[PDB]
Design a protein around this ligand. Structure first.
Ligand SMILES: [Cl-]
Ligand SMILES: [Co+2]
Length: 129
């Protein structure tokens, strides 16, 4: 599924991401835009052989099991395919674990490089939330 901006914002809010660990909703929308262009089916292979999955590009070395990443820790206890669903629950639940791991949203390089320190409120402007 390719979400609209406000549609994604509303779904993220319903799943409790607004101000989760102090990160306002716009941060999450911005991260999703630059990680996946709001496409739940996005996959991208990394140089280390791991793969990133879904709307928030969650990686198979640490977080989910894709059956081809040796030494995967699978800390979210899910198959990576679950992160490609039109229903964002699994992605959100795993993202909550990732953001709690010590480095906050710096875990997403696209967030650090393209969202951090910008006017992230713009990402939810206009939306009925
Ligand atoms: Cl933080
Ligand atoms: Co990545």
């Amino acid at each position: 599924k390719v979400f609209g901006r406000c549609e994604l914002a509303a779904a993220m809010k319903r799943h409790g991401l607004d101000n989760y660990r102090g990160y306002s909703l716009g941060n999450w929308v911005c991260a999703a835009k630059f990680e996946s262009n709001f496409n739940t089916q996005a996959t991208n292979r990394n140089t280390d052989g791991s793969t990133d999955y879904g709307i928030l590009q969650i990686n198979s070395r640490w977080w989910c099991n894709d059956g081809r990443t040796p030494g995967s820790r699978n800390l979210c206890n899910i198959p990576c395919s679950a992160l490609l669903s039109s229903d964002i629950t699994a992605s959100v639940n795993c993202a909550k674990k990732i953001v709690s791991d010590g480095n906050g949203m710096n875990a997403w390089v696209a967030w650090r490089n393209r969202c951090k320190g910008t006017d992230v409120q713009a990402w939810i402007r206009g939306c009925r939330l």
